[PDB]
Design a protein around this nucleic acid. Sequence first.
DNA 1: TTGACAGGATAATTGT
DNA 2: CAATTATCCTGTCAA
Lengths: 56, 56
Amino acid sequence: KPRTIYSSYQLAALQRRFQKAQYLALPERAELAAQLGLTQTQVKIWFQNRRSKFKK
Amino acid sequence: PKVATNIMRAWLFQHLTHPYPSEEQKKQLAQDTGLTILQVNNWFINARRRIVQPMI
DNA sequence: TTGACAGGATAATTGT
DNA sequence: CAATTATCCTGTCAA
């Protein structure tokens, strides 16, 4: 909180990454985000944001 | 509505980049101009696009 | 030539 | 991990 715009691009480097990998831990998170600037807990959520819609 | 605005805009150089005002900081910008707190978020999110958007 | 509400999308909260 | 509560962003027209 608040909503925190991520939100330039940034993004859909993930949308295939989700298609690649619905899992990751810490070790990637540097180049994964430190070259991108944003914090840890900003996106530990973001798979969990997208384990729905649907995902029946 | 008149001059319930340039107050809003004259400071806006402060959070031009980051319209992520604090939830109670809406108040010190609200009541000083006031009116329904719901109407005030709306005015600051119906102007991101009026300009600056074409200014790119 | 600018300001109100419903709609459909989204990011945090949070504790059995 | 599912369920929540807080968000703006657009997308429907109006004095």
